[PDB]
Amino acid sequence: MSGVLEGSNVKPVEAMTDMIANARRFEMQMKVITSVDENEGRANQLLSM
Amino acid sequence: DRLDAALRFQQEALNLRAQRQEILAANIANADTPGYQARDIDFASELKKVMVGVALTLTSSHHIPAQAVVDLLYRVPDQPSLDGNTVDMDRERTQFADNSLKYQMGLTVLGSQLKGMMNVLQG
Prior knowledge:
This is part of a larger assembly, with chains A and B. Chain A starts with 11 loop residues before the first helix and ends in a 6-residue tail after the last helix. Chain A is 65% helix and 0% strand. Chain A is rod-shaped, with a radius of gyration of 24 Å. Chain A has 1 helix and no strands. In chain A, 0% of the residues are buried. By secondary structure, chain A is an all-alpha fold. Chain B has helices at residues 2-29, 43-51, 89-121; strands at 39-40, 73-74. Chain B has a two-stranded antiparallel sheet with strand order 1-2. Chain B starts with a helix and ends with a helix. Chain A: Belongs to the flagella basal body rod proteins family.
């Protein structure tokens, strides 16, 4: 068809849901990292005889 | 010498504990090396082997006397890492603490035997 230009197909609902899910997943992984680090910090005293 | 035969077992146990302590600390130090395998020794078998040589003959004074000069087993990995490192923190930390305790116990036993041999002689 002549006289019409096609735009993008970026769905905003999908983008918003993806951002929410990404933020929540990032926070969960940061919490896991903190837990593991604290556990190793507590565990690295056994070596004291 | 008969004195060596009495103290041979504890000296060999103490030396083996020191060697295994060095091996465990090497495992701890190389925890972050990718592709490093965690190595260890079987204490009992090596203690048997050490507990179970020919000084060359010196004909005169100028003749020079003879000049003197363990097997490592791989640890079974528990968790598969991506960089190929099989060193586990918890297992080797417990083994390190246990080896330290046993080294202290061997020192105590050897010192007690030497002190008894001494108070037999003192007088």
